[PDB]
Structures are given as C-alpha cells and as structure tokens.
Amino acid sequence: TIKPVEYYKPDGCNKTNDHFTMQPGVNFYTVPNLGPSSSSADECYTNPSFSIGSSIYMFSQEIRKTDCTTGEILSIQIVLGRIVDKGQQGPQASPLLVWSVPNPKIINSCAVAAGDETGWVLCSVTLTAASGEPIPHMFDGFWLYKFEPDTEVVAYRITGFAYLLDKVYDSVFIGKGGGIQRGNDLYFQMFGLSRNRQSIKALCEHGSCLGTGGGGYQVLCDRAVMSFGSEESLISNAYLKVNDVASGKPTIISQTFPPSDSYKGSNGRIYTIGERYGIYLAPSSWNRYLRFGLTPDISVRSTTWLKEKDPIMKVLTTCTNTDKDMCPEICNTRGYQDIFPLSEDSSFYTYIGITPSNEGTKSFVAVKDDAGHVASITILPNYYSITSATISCFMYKEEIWCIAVTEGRKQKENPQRIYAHSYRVQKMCFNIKP
Amino acid sequence: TIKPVEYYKPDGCNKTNDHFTMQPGVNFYTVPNLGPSSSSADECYTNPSFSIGSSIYMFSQEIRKTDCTTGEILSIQIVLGRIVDKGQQGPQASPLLVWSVPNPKIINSCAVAAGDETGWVLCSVTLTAASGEPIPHMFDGFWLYKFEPDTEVVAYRITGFAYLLDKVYDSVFIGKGGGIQRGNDLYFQMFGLSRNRQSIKALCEHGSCLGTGGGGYQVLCDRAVMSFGSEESLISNAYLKVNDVASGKPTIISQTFPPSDSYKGSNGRIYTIGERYGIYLAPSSWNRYLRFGLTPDISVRSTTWLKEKDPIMKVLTTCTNTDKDMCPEICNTRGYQDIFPLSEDSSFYTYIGITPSNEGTKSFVAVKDDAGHVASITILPNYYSITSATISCFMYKEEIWCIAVTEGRKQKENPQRIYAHSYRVQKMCFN
Amino acid sequence: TIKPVEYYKPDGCNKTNDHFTMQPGVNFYTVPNLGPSSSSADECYTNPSFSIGSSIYMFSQEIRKTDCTTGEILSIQIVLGRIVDKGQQGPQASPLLVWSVPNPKIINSCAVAAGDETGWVLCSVTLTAASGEPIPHMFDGFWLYKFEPDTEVVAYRITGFAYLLDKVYDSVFIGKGGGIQRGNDLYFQMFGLSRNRQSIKALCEHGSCLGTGGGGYQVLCDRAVMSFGSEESLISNAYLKVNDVASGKPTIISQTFPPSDSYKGSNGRIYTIGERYGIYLAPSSWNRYLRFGLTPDISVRSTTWLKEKDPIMKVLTTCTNTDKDMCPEICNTRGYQDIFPLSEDSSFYTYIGITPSNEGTKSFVAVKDDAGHVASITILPNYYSITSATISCFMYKEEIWCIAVTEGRKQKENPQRIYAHSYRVQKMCFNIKP
Structure with a gap:
C-alpha cells in the first residue's frame, strides 16, 4: 500500500525561466486513531515517538498524571500499526498491536524505530532503590522491545557489558524523535549528563551581538x-548503535558529539536519507535555529550541519x-x-512552523526549496495550541505523502493530547515570468 | 657533511663493573628555518613529517585554518634541504626547494621519505564529489611526489589497479612519522578504516585491573x-610498499596488522635500523606505552615488539x-x-618525553640504556607547551647528532607552530 | 575387514531415461575415539590429517595453546588404528598406537599416509637457534616416521643431500590432507615460500568482472x-616424492607447480584414484572453487584440473x-x-559443504553425479560450527562407506575439537522422463 519515499526530481522543467518547486498539499486530513487516547482530563498525553517503515508504523506516547513536564509517568503506550487506504481523502491508520511498557515509573524515556514488518522500542531506565522506587536522574541501562504482528513482544535487557558508552553518563534519555533500522543494526539518538574532565570551547555561532x-x-x-x-x-x-539485533544478544554503543560541535544536548531523531543518514537535534538552549546534520556512515566526523535556519523554534522557550x-x-x-528531507542532500524538506500568538499557537505546514523559498499553508485554525511536530513521509497513491504528529490542545481548557494529520507534497514546473 | 648513523659500540670497556651507556648532550641547540613559517595568528602549523637521508632531509607541514585538528587545510608545504654545518654550536638546515602540494583540500595526509639526493612525499587523497569539493574520510588512491635538486617535482597518480591493498579500506591516512627508501622500493606506514567480517580478539595487554x-x-x-x-x-x-619507483609506474601494496597483534590504528613511522627495519605506532587509544616493532624484512609476521614502556604518552588524551x-x-x-634507535637491537634509543603541568607541558630529552637506565635533560622550559616530537639522527662532526621536530606554542596565546632543535649523544663507560 | 574402495558402476540402466547416480546414506553415524581428545579448555585441536589404507588408518592432530591458528604447538599426536566392526550402525575405530611427534615446537606441519599394515608421517621442520628455540617461518629438512602394528616407530632425518627440491624454499609446509604410498615410494603435497627471479603470469581464470x-x-x-x-x-x-622408503635411506624430491598453473599455495592432499592419481588444493586466496587435479604419473605436467566448481569454500575467508x-x-x-572420488574419472565424488550462518555454520554431506546433480543431506544440526572436512572412503560390509573428519565446536563456548563420522554411498538407477 505504501512504499519508502522516492525522492523525486523534475522529469521535465530543464527550461529557461522554469523553477522546479515543491509545496504542501492544500489540505490537512485527519488520521484518526493512530493511537488510543483517554478522555480523562487529569491525564496528559506527551512525548510521542513516530517512525514509519516499509509498510508498518511505530508510535509511542507517555501518559502522565496532571503535569505534562514533571508529572508522574502513569503509562507508556506503544502502537504497531499499518498505513493503509480506507477510501478516505488521505492515508489512514490501522492499529495492529497496543501494548504498555512494564514498570513505567523506572523509564527515563523511550523512542521507536520502524523497519520491515518489525518494530522497535528503546528505553533508558533509571536506578531503583531497594523499595523499587525510581531514584530519578540516573542511569541503569536499557530495555529493547521488539514488536511483530502475531508475535509476543520480545524483551531484551541491556545492562552491564551489553552497553559501552564513550563517555561515562550519569543520566541517559533516548531522543523522542526516534531511530532507524539499517540491516542488523538500530540507530537512535540520546542525550544526557556525561562526566567531563577536560576544558572545552562550546559551539558558539551567532549573529550580531553587543560586546562580542x-x-x-x-x-x-x-x-x-x-x-x-x-x-x-x-x-x-x-x-546509539544497537548491534547484533537478530542475534538476540543486543549490544548498545555510543559516540558523543563534543561541545565544540553541538549545543546543549536535546531530544533528537535519526533519519535514513537514501544511501546516507541524518540527525535532528531540537533546540534546548539559546540556539533556536534548525540543527540538522547529514552523514554518510553515522559518525560525528562525517556529520555536516545544514546552513538553513527554518523552522526557527519560537515556542516553549x-x-x-x-x-x-x-x-x-x-x-x-x-x-x-x-x-523530513525531500531530496538526497535535503536541500528540499518539509516541516511545521509554530509561532505563538496570544498564549495560543498559530501553525503552518511548509516545504523549503533549494533556493531558500518556503511554501507555507496555515493549518489547524480551530486548534487552540500546537507545541510540537514530528513528520514522516512516504509514497502513497504514487505521490509523496507525509503524516505529522503534533502535541496540543484542541480547546484551551482541554488536557494536552496528541493529534495526527496527513498531507501530500506536490511538484510543479511553473514558468514564471516576472 | 653528515652520514647515516653509525650505532657505535664500546671501543674499550669490557671490564668488570664497567657499563657502556649513552646519554644526551648538556645543551639544546636551535635549528632555525628548517622550513618556512607564517606569523598569521589565524593559521596552525601541524602534522609535520621529518626524514633525513644520506645528506638531504625532507620536511612537510600542514597549514590549517584556526583548528590544529579539524581546521581546513589551507596548504601542505614540502621542503627539501641539506643538513650542513654553518659554524654554529650544532648542525643547521639549508633549504633547497620549497613546494606546495596541489589541491590540498583533497589530501587525507602526507608523509616524507629521505633517500640519497632524492626525496619522496606520499599522500592519500579522498574522493572528490561532482562539485569538486572533497568528501570527508573517504579514499581515492594516492599521489607520489619525487623531489630532487634542480629537477621539476615529478608527480605520480596511483589509482585503480596501481594500488592493491590486502584489506578493503574506506579511509586511508599515511603515517606522519614518514618512511624509508630501500633500493628501488619505498616503505611507509598507513592506517584507516578497513572492512571486517570475522570475529576478533584484540590485543589487550595491561597491568593489574579489577573490573567488577x-x-x-x-x-x-x-x-x-x-x-x-x-x-x-x-x-x-x-x-605500505611502493614498488618500481624507478619505472615511473609506481605500485602501492599493503599488508595489515590484525587486531590480535595491534591496538587502534594510529600515526606511525618506518625506520631503517642497520640491516633490519623498525616501526613506531603512536598511541591512539587506551594503551599509551611505547609501541615499537623490529622486523628483518618488513612483514607483520616478522615484526617483534620492544618490551620497554618509555616514552609513555601522557598528553593529548x-x-x-x-x-x-x-x-x-x-x-x-x-x-x-x-x-630514534641507537643500537642494532634498539635496546639503546633516544626519545623526547612530554608531561602535562597546568595545561602547559614540561619536556625532557632522554636516552635509554640496555640496562634500563634513562639519562634525561629538561628542555625548552621557556616554551609554554610542546605536544609532539619526531627525532632523526645521523653522524655529524664524528659524533651522533639528533634533530627533533616538535609542535607547540612558544607562549600560551600563540598559534601552534613547528620548531626544530639539535643535540648530541655522548658515549661513556661508567664504573 | 575393510578393503580399498571398488568404484562401482551400473550393472543395469542402459535404458531410455535411466540414470545411474550415487547418493549419501541417510545417516551420519559417529565414529568415537578415532583419536584421543582432552577436556582442557585451554587447548585447541587443529589441522587433522587422515588417511585410510588397506585396513589400518593413520590420523594426526596438532594440539595448540589457546589459538587454533597461531597458538604454540603443545603436541602433535599420531594415531595408528584399524577400521573395524564393533557391532554398530556404522564402522568404528580401534586405536592401536598413540604417539607424539618429538619436539613439536620445531615442526612446521606433518601429514600422514596409510599403507598396507604400515603408516607414515612426514613433517617439515624449521631452523633452530643455538638456544634450541625455533626460528619461525624457516626450513630445515624433514622427519619421516614409520608406524607398524606392534612395532616401535622408526625415525628418519632427511637433511642436506637427502632432499633435492626443484626450487630454493625458505619455508616448507606439508599439506595436511596427507599422502599415499605407491610401491616403495610415498607421495605428499607441500607448499611454501620459494625464491623467484623470473617474471610470471599467474593463473587468473574468473567470471564476469568489471574493469576486465x-x-x-x-x-x-x-x-x-x-x-x-x-x-x-x-x-x-x-x-613431494619420498624414494627408497624401504631402504632406510629415504630421499625427498620436489616438483613445483608454476604460477601459470596454480593459485596461491595451500594445504593439499594426494589421492590414489584407481590406476591414476589425484591432488586436492584447498583455496588459500581469491579463487574459492574446487581445485582438484587428475594425473596418470604424478607430474605437474600431466595434471588436469576438474571443471566442476563444488564444493565452494564459503567459510574462513x-x-x-x-x-x-x-x-x-x-x-x-x-x-x-x-x-573423495567415487569413479575412475572423478565425475562422481562425495564431499561436505559448509555455509556460514549467524556466526555458526550449517553443514551438509553430498554426492555429485556425472550429470551435475548433487544429492545433499543436512548433517550435524546440533553442532554450533564445523569449519573443515577430510573424507576417506573404503569397502565395508560390501558397500562403499566414508569417514569424515571435521574440525569444529559442538557448542559455541567450547574450544575447537576434531570429530569423526561415517556414512555410506548408495547407488541408484533413477528413471525420470520430461
């Protein structure tokens, strides 16, 4: 029904005064019941992870008590499903399994990765006291959960020598953006407190400032x-690399970006981009520009950072x-x-921009052009606020279609929920004569 | 004026309670203008390669923008010169040619080899994309440059079937220590990413350690x-062996140390030690002891590793x-x-030690005795820091003399530069 | 009790669409205690040599410390036994002598040859320093050991004028496959470093390759x-030919395959094939196809190489x-x-194939017929890995029976050992019509 996205280029154009552009589809169709949601107003749905594979998708959400930021994690819910055509305007979601992460009080965070008829959830866990109560802010290895239709969820505890991290980490969080599967390996992004004994010069690129x-x-x-x-x-x-995944003896390895090459650590995401790979690092600190890297073989040295600034993160700061x-x-x-990249060098890409207006948010969907042009459409005008967005695209009905997963509140007094929408990316050869 | 080093042995001694030792000279002479240097405070001079032949020397340096490690290579500069006596306390350097490596943005790294009135630079190069801009950490063969007085630099491209490597390499760097010429062949060291599909047991020698x-x-x-x-x-x-150097069609061949017999790949150097040959491998990983090998015919199987631990690498880690x-x-x-070895079995050798003190470095020059005695003299105390050292010795004025090329900063806020000094090795019969 | 194999041909068929094939027996019976084996996990049993004569067999194994490849040779153990019937499903082994090769630290390699109530071990040795310690990768002549039931082993040093080799060899290794006795002579295969002063054109037969x-x-x-x-x-x-073996003054002669007629030197084996002879050369370099030669008088020049490709070596490369x-x-x-050939032309022959699977090996026993059909039966499924095989067949209970000697590990964490099994070769006249 769906295929991994085929980064398409102009079959025509190649003409004087013609520009090959891409832009979002006119509509923003709902994708209902991508995952379950309670109506309990005392519960916050937060920190989704969304990844799309060959045909399946993996989705996860934290259910917390009261406070979206620091409230107790009541549940972590995982959904393995499939993207299908249910005869609607756009693609739709068919859940195949719904599952809960055991002992959610010990989890620091989880993220998902979708492959071929198989999905993965990687979770970092904190130390437990003798009481069983979590000792927060700490690190006690990982859990890896393998999902497959009509197969019991497979659990792997990675601890001890199953993990080797290039720095010594006091806390570890898996980046909620998600990861990817490549062959017999998984790749995720993580961030945390690493012990440091050497002097540093942190990455410090900025504009015109006074006292520079x-x-x-x-x-x-x-x-x-x-x-x-x-x-x-x-x-x-x-x-994070997860080695020997089919063996049944998964091993987790790390390599850390030095401060000279990164801003404050933050939730990230790993991308498969044709024959190469990519990394997104959300802003967590003073630098709110797009932090996105390209790499041929997933290493810190081969990671090159896009020079474009869009989206600029304007909310939750x-x-x-x-x-x-x-x-x-x-x-x-x-x-x-x-x-989500739309070309091999990701000079074309789709995103969602969020600008705060009157303690609410106004949101647009956009596609960035190799020249730097951004084609934007206002979206969700009836929604009170949208605070986050993860986008995964694919081939559907012989076109590029993207699903966007967004935290928000439909109405001001609602508890935060997670909402899913779909749109297509359209290609044109307009002949523009000034 | 200079001759290849003559590992000199006890002429007398041979008596009870008499021991033949070697030690460094009391003074540390400058060797100015071995190669040119800019004053531009935005330029780092790094990764030198220094080799001394029959009478000529070869020197190369990377000039990088801002960062000594990862900054863009603005230039790779080569100097062919002669070691001569200009009437100073110690030997001095006379540049004969100064030349730049073309398209340095494509170089992975280069190293030098000094022969008899002829010198060599071997460079590994990365793939160039459709833009012409380099693709980082990739491999696209080699360039070999032959240097000779009053002769145009001769260039040789070595791609496709002109290089055959025993493992398939995704990235290749020539060891900055340099290489040697033996007859019609060159020998260098190289390191990089080689693909591997077989299980391994890496070399893992250490002391007393109690992991839980x-x-x-x-x-x-x-x-x-x-x-x-x-x-x-x-x-x-x-x-690396470079065959058929005289043909004008040089061919490069490789054989790789297995993990069982090596630590992480690293910058290395190939040595001529009388009738035999030697290899240095800088530490790049947890094992910071001296890694030095001896070999009769330059093969992995015939390489035997010296048991002495000095110098221990204590900086840049x-x-x-x-x-x-x-x-x-x-x-x-x-x-x-x-x-630099001073005897045939390299049980006598000289080296430079660097110990970190308050984010500056304290430095000494030293010589190892076969008993294990170490004769050391503090050097460059006025320099803020020294971070690297390569040493090449020779006969000069009927004595063993060594030149050491060192990266460092004269004062703390200076950009890194490259400095050359000389000292002599004296032989004694202590009782 | 056993007789040298009688290559057996169709007494029937000669009918339309009737094909005479050969195939392996359904079972893979154990042959326990063909030679002794330690339980010390510090010891690797490696490089077996196995030969079957008139009724006796000769077997040898290297026992090395820790590493199967490069570990110090602690022992070289020789077993002379007889293939006998102990009332089992298959043929069994009765060790008659067990003996150790003196000063194993000096040996390059040994191999065996089984004759008529007499067996032979030929070993090449390296130079010794004055310390008595071996100078590795070097050559210092040969030892030949004669074994006979109820008779002490006889040693023959073969140095200086007693060996005449066609090239000057800096190192010499006897091919672990073994050799044969023909009349008053022995024949082995050997390989090593020979000095070379002339230009060459090495054999370079391959398939479709780009840049050719x-x-x-x-x-x-x-x-x-x-x-x-x-x-x-x-x-x-x-x-290698060993002349005047009954003289007590044996002489060793060598003829070397030119590079034009050979791939990289490797462990080999000599065969008696009816009135003619054969040579097996294991792949040691890029060409992994079956390298097997037929020769009427054991000359480099009279050797013809089989065109069949099976078994292809897929392990240890x-x-x-x-x-x-x-x-x-x-x-x-x-x-x-x-x-092991099953006909005079070796158009029929039995072998064992090994294919790598998930850091283990999958193994099968097979018989290839003159048309090119291969009859394969999976074997040793419970074994973790098998990495090598030498096969020798013979007459037993009026049928062809083969014994296979295989290096491998029964379970993953075991040290490598050597295992012996038996199977029979059955003849069929299948009738198939298009």
Whole structure:
C-alpha cells in the first residue's frame, strides 16, 4: 500500500525561466486513531515517538498524571500499526498491536524505530532503590522491545557489558524523535549528563551581538552546555548503535558529539536519507535555529550541519534573544519541531512552523526549496495550541505523502493530547515570468 | 657533511663493573628555518613529517585554518634541504626547494621519505564529489611526489589497479612519522578504516585491573579497534610498499596488522635500523606505552615488539587510567612522540618525553640504556607547551647528532607552530 | 575387514531415461575415539590429517595453546588404528598406537599416509637457534616416521643431500590432507615460500568482472601469489616424492607447480584414484572453487584440473567476491573441504559443504553425479560450527562407506575439537522422463 519515499526530481522543467518547486498539499486530513487516547482530563498525553517503515508504523506516547513536564509517568503506550487506504481523502491508520511498557515509573524515556514488518522500542531506565522506587536522574541501562504482528513482544535487557558508552553518563534519555533500522543494526539518538574532565570551547555561532569582542559570549556558550554544581558535567548528544539485533544478544554503543560541535544536548531523531543518514537535534538552549546534520556512515566526523535556519523554534522557550541574531544566553527550550528531507542532500524538506500568538499557537505546514523559498499553508485554525511536530513521509497513491504528529490542545481548557494529520507534497514546473 | 648513523659500540670497556651507556648532550641547540613559517595568528602549523637521508632531509607541514585538528587545510608545504654545518654550536638546515602540494583540500595526509639526493612525499587523497569539493574520510588512491635538486617535482597518480591493498579500506591516512627508501622500493606506514567480517580478539595487554565484571577488558579492547558507523570496520595499521619507483609506474601494496597483534590504528613511522627495519605506532587509544616493532624484512609476521614502556604518552588524551597499569577504557589519544634507535637491537634509543603541568607541558630529552637506565635533560622550559616530537639522527662532526621536530606554542596565546632543535649523544663507560 | 574402495558402476540402466547416480546414506553415524581428545579448555585441536589404507588408518592432530591458528604447538599426536566392526550402525575405530611427534615446537606441519599394515608421517621442520628455540617461518629438512602394528616407530632425518627440491624454499609446509604410498615410494603435497627471479603470469581464470578490459586483474592475480616484504618470493605448491622408503635411506624430491598453473599455495592432499592419481588444493586466496587435479604419473605436467566448481569454500575467508563470478582480489582463505572420488574419472565424488550462518555454520554431506546433480543431506544440526572436512572412503560390509573428519565446536563456548563420522554411498538407477 505504501512504499519508502522516492525522492523525486523534475522529469521535465530543464527550461529557461522554469523553477522546479515543491509545496504542501492544500489540505490537512485527519488520521484518526493512530493511537488510543483517554478522555480523562487529569491525564496528559506527551512525548510521542513516530517512525514509519516499509509498510508498518511505530508510535509511542507517555501518559502522565496532571503535569505534562514533571508529572508522574502513569503509562507508556506503544502502537504497531499499518498505513493503509480506507477510501478516505488521505492515508489512514490501522492499529495492529497496543501494548504498555512494564514498570513505567523506572523509564527515563523511550523512542521507536520502524523497519520491515518489525518494530522497535528503546528505553533508558533509571536506578531503583531497594523499595523499587525510581531514584530519578540516573542511569541503569536499557530495555529493547521488539514488536511483530502475531508475535509476543520480545524483551531484551541491556545492562552491564551489553552497553559501552564513550563517555561515562550519569543520566541517559533516548531522543523522542526516534531511530532507524539499517540491516542488523538500530540507530537512535540520546542525550544526557556525561562526566567531563577536560576544558572545552562550546559551539558558539551567532549573529550580531553587543560586546562580542569580549570572550563573554563564549563564556555564555560554554556555560550553556554545562551542569550547575560541585561536579560540573556536560549535557551532551550522542549516537546509539544497537548491534547484533537478530542475534538476540543486543549490544548498545555510543559516540558523543563534543561541545565544540553541538549545543546543549536535546531530544533528537535519526533519519535514513537514501544511501546516507541524518540527525535532528531540537533546540534546548539559546540556539533556536534548525540543527540538522547529514552523514554518510553515522559518525560525528562525517556529520555536516545544514546552513538553513527554518523552522526557527519560537515556542516553549525562556529565551529572549532575537530570531535575527540569536545572541547566547542561559535559557531553556523544550519544544520539538523536526523536518523530513525531500531530496538526497535535503536541500528540499518539509516541516511545521509554530509561532505563538496570544498564549495560543498559530501553525503552518511548509516545504523549503533549494533556493531558500518556503511554501507555507496555515493549518489547524480551530486548534487552540500546537507545541510540537514530528513528520514522516512516504509514497502513497504514487505521490509523496507525509503524516505529522503534533502535541496540543484542541480547546484551551482541554488536557494536552496528541493529534495526527496527513498531507501530500506536490511538484510543479511553473514558468514564471516576472 | 653528515652520514647515516653509525650505532657505535664500546671501543674499550669490557671490564668488570664497567657499563657502556649513552646519554644526551648538556645543551639544546636551535635549528632555525628548517622550513618556512607564517606569523598569521589565524593559521596552525601541524602534522609535520621529518626524514633525513644520506645528506638531504625532507620536511612537510600542514597549514590549517584556526583548528590544529579539524581546521581546513589551507596548504601542505614540502621542503627539501641539506643538513650542513654553518659554524654554529650544532648542525643547521639549508633549504633547497620549497613546494606546495596541489589541491590540498583533497589530501587525507602526507608523509616524507629521505633517500640519497632524492626525496619522496606520499599522500592519500579522498574522493572528490561532482562539485569538486572533497568528501570527508573517504579514499581515492594516492599521489607520489619525487623531489630532487634542480629537477621539476615529478608527480605520480596511483589509482585503480596501481594500488592493491590486502584489506578493503574506506579511509586511508599515511603515517606522519614518514618512511624509508630501500633500493628501488619505498616503505611507509598507513592506517584507516578497513572492512571486517570475522570475529576478533584484540590485543589487550595491561597491568593489574579489577573490573567488577572482570570480563570487560577483552570486550573493551575489542571495541577500541572497531568503528562506530554503518559498516563493521576496524581502525587498523598496515605497511605500505611502493614498488618500481624507478619505472615511473609506481605500485602501492599493503599488508595489515590484525587486531590480535595491534591496538587502534594510529600515526606511525618506518625506520631503517642497520640491516633490519623498525616501526613506531603512536598511541591512539587506551594503551599509551611505547609501541615499537623490529622486523628483518618488513612483514607483520616478522615484526617483534620492544618490551620497554618509555616514552609513555601522557598528553593529548581523554584517558584516565594509570601509567602503572594502563587499564583499557574507551578514550582517545592524539599525540606523537617517536624514538630514534641507537643500537642494532634498539635496546639503546633516544626519545623526547612530554608531561602535562597546568595545561602547559614540561619536556625532557632522554636516552635509554640496555640496562634500563634513562639519562634525561629538561628542555625548552621557556616554551609554554610542546605536544609532539619526531627525532632523526645521523653522524655529524664524528659524533651522533639528533634533530627533533616538535609542535607547540612558544607562549600560551600563540598559534601552534613547528620548531626544530639539535643535540648530541655522548658515549661513556661508567664504573 | 575393510578393503580399498571398488568404484562401482551400473550393472543395469542402459535404458531410455535411466540414470545411474550415487547418493549419501541417510545417516551420519559417529565414529568415537578415532583419536584421543582432552577436556582442557585451554587447548585447541587443529589441522587433522587422515588417511585410510588397506585396513589400518593413520590420523594426526596438532594440539595448540589457546589459538587454533597461531597458538604454540603443545603436541602433535599420531594415531595408528584399524577400521573395524564393533557391532554398530556404522564402522568404528580401534586405536592401536598413540604417539607424539618429538619436539613439536620445531615442526612446521606433518601429514600422514596409510599403507598396507604400515603408516607414515612426514613433517617439515624449521631452523633452530643455538638456544634450541625455533626460528619461525624457516626450513630445515624433514622427519619421516614409520608406524607398524606392534612395532616401535622408526625415525628418519632427511637433511642436506637427502632432499633435492626443484626450487630454493625458505619455508616448507606439508599439506595436511596427507599422502599415499605407491610401491616403495610415498607421495605428499607441500607448499611454501620459494625464491623467484623470473617474471610470471599467474593463473587468473574468473567470471564476469568489471574493469576486465586492460587486464589489471592479471596484476591482482600475479600479486595474489606473492609475499609482502623486503624479499618478494612465491607462495607455491609442489609434489613431494619420498624414494627408497624401504631402504632406510629415504630421499625427498620436489616438483613445483608454476604460477601459470596454480593459485596461491595451500594445504593439499594426494589421492590414489584407481590406476591414476589425484591432488586436492584447498583455496588459500581469491579463487574459492574446487581445485582438484587428475594425473596418470604424478607430474605437474600431466595434471588436469576438474571443471566442476563444488564444493565452494564459503567459510574462513576474508574474500568478498561473489560465488557466481569469483573476481580476483587480495584476500586470504584458510578453510579445508576436500572431496573423495567415487569413479575412475572423478565425475562422481562425495564431499561436505559448509555455509556460514549467524556466526555458526550449517553443514551438509553430498554426492555429485556425472550429470551435475548433487544429492545433499543436512548433517550435524546440533553442532554450533564445523569449519573443515577430510573424507576417506573404503569397502565395508560390501558397500562403499566414508569417514569424515571435521574440525569444529559442538557448542559455541567450547574450544575447537576434531570429530569423526561415517556414512555410506548408495547407488541408484533413477528413471525420470520430461
């Protein structure tokens, strides 16, 4: 029914005064019941992970009590399903399994990865006291859960020597964006507190700021990635590889981006981009520009960062710097708005932009052009607020179609829920004569 | 003026309670203008290669923008010169040619080899995309440049069937220590990502270590040589031979050290030691001891590793293990401090040690005795830091003299530069 | 009790659509205690040599410390026994002598040959320092050991004028497949480093490969047989003849296969095939097809190579070429899977195939018929891995029976051991019509 996306190029154009552009479809169709949702107003649905494979999809959501940020994790719900045509305007969702993560009080975070008729959930867990109660902010290895239709969920505990991390981590969170399967391996992104014993010079690219001549901005940038304390350690990003996945003896390996090449660690996502791979790192700190990397073989050295700035993250931030110059300061950003590449070098890509208006959010769907042009359509005008977006695209009915998963509140007094929509990406050869 | 080093042995001694030792000279003479240097504070001079032949020397340096490690290569500069006496306390350097490597943005790395009135630069190059811009960490064959006084630099491209390597390599770097010429052949060291599909047991020699599981050390040692990436590959060291150098159609051949017999791949150097040959491999991973091999015909099987531990590499490392026990862990070392052998079995050799003090370095020059005695003299105290050293020795004024080429910063806020100094090795019969 | 094999031909068929084929027996019976085996997990049993004569057999095994490839040779153990019927499903082994080769630390390799109530071990030895310690990778003549029931072993040192080799060899290894006795002579295969002063054109037969134009593949092939070093010399194969073996003054003669007629030198085996003879050469380099030769008088020149490709060696190799085309490359193969001929022309023969599966091996026993049909039966499914096979057949209970000697690990964490099994060869006249 669906196929992995075929990055399409102009069969025609190749003409004087013609531009090959891409743009979002006119409509934003609902994809109902991608996953289950309670109507209980005391419950917050948050931190989704969404990945689409050959034909199946993997989706996960945390159900927390009261507070979306710090409320107790009441449940972590996983859905394996399939993208199918139920005769609607756009593609639809058919859940095949719904499953709950055991002992959710010990989970730091989970994320999903969709492959071929098989799906994965990777979770990091914190240390447990003798009481069984979680000792928060800590790290006690991983759980890997393998999902497959009509097969019991398979559990793997990765602990001890099943993991080897290039730095020593006091806390570990799997990036909610998700990961990918490549052959007999999985790839995720994770971030956390790594112990650090060496001096650093954190990545500190910014615009026109006052007092730049003094090293004061570099001191800000360096402080941004550190920890407050007697023991100062770094909030850092890293790749996780899950080796020997079919063997039944999975091993997890890490390599960490040095502060010289990253901003504060944050929720991330791993992408398969043709023969190459990609990484998205949401803003968590003062730099709110798009942080997206391209890599041929999934290493820190081969990761190159896109120079385009869109989407600029404007919600869920205590920062006060300008979108023009993005001057460094100590502040916190905790949103998520990733992209989906539409070409092999990802010079074309689709995303969702969110701008705050009157303690609500106004949202648009957009496709970025190789020139830098952004084709945008306002979306969800009836919705009160949308705070996050993850997008996964594919071939459906011989066109590129994307599903976007967004946290938000339909009405102001609702508890936060998670909503799924679909749209298509259209290609044109307009002849534009000024 | 200079001759290849004559490992000189006790002329007298041979008496009870008499021991033949060697030691460094009391003074540390400068060797100015071995190669040119810019004052541009935005340029880092890094990764030198220094080799001394019959009478000429070869020197090469990368000039990079801003960052000494990962900054863009603005230039790769080669100097062919002669070691001569200009009436100073010690020997001096006379540049004969200065030349730049074309398209340095495509180079992975280069190294030099000094012969008899002729010198060589071997460079590995990465793939160039359709844009002409380099693709990082990839491989597209080699360039060989032959240098000779009053002769145009002769270039040789070595791609496709002109290079045949015993493993399939995705990335290749020539070891910055340099190489040697033997007859019609050259020998260099190289390292890189080689694809591997067979299970391994990496070389994993250490001291007393008590990991809670205890089985961790072999698994650690196994990871250290493996690569994080899409494809299972090993970071591996290997010998390069350049055949048929006179033909004008040079061919490059490889053989790789298995993980069982090596640590993580790293910058290396090939040595001529009388009738035999030697290899230095800088530490790149948890094992920071001296890794030096001896071989009669330059093969992996005939390579025997010296048991002495000095110099221990203590700078440019994220490792936290002890110099006593060297327990394996996942960490990176990126220094280079080779030795120069002073006897046939390389039981006598000179080296430079660097110890970190308050984010500056304290440095000494030293000579090893066959008993294990170490004769050391502090050097460059006024320099803020020295981070690397390559040493090449020779006969000069009827004595053994060594030149050491060192990366470092004269004062803390300077950009890194490359400095050359000389010293002599004196022979004594202590009682 | 047993007789040398009587290659058996169709007494019937000669009918339309009737085909005379041969096939393996349904069962794979154990042959326990063919030779002794330790329980010490520090010891690897490797490089077996197995030969069956008139009624006795000769068997040898290297016992090395830790590493099967390069571990120190702790022992070289020889067993002379008889194939007998102990009332089992299959034939069984009665060890008659067990003996250790003196000073195993000096041995390069040994191999065996079983005759008529007499067996032989031929060993090549390296040079010794004055310390008594071996100088590896070097050559210092031979030892020949004569074994006979109820008789002490006889030793023959063969040095200096007692060996005449056609090339100057710096290292010499006897092919572990073994040799034969013909009259008053023995015949083995050996390989090693021979000095080379003349240009060469190494055998370079392969399939469809890209870049073939302009040769250059010939350059690979030429390189593949050479040695890396200060001294380049050739890794070459050769026949050994041991003359006047009853004299008590044995002399060893060598004829070397030129590179033009050989791939990289490797462990080999000599066969008696009716009135003619045969040679097996395990793949050691890029060509992994069956290398088997037929010769009427054991000369390099009279050797003809079989055109069949099976068994293809798929284990113990760093090569990455395809089984379809076998493109040359610089790589190493260190397996051993020989055949046993079942007819005078070796158009019928039995073998064992090994295919790698998930860091284990899957194995089958097979018989190839003159038309090209292969009858295969999976064997040793409970075994973790099997990496090598030598097969010798014979008459037993008026049928052809074969014994197969295989290196492998019964379970994954075991040290490598050597295992012996038996099976029979059955003849059929199938009738199939299009």
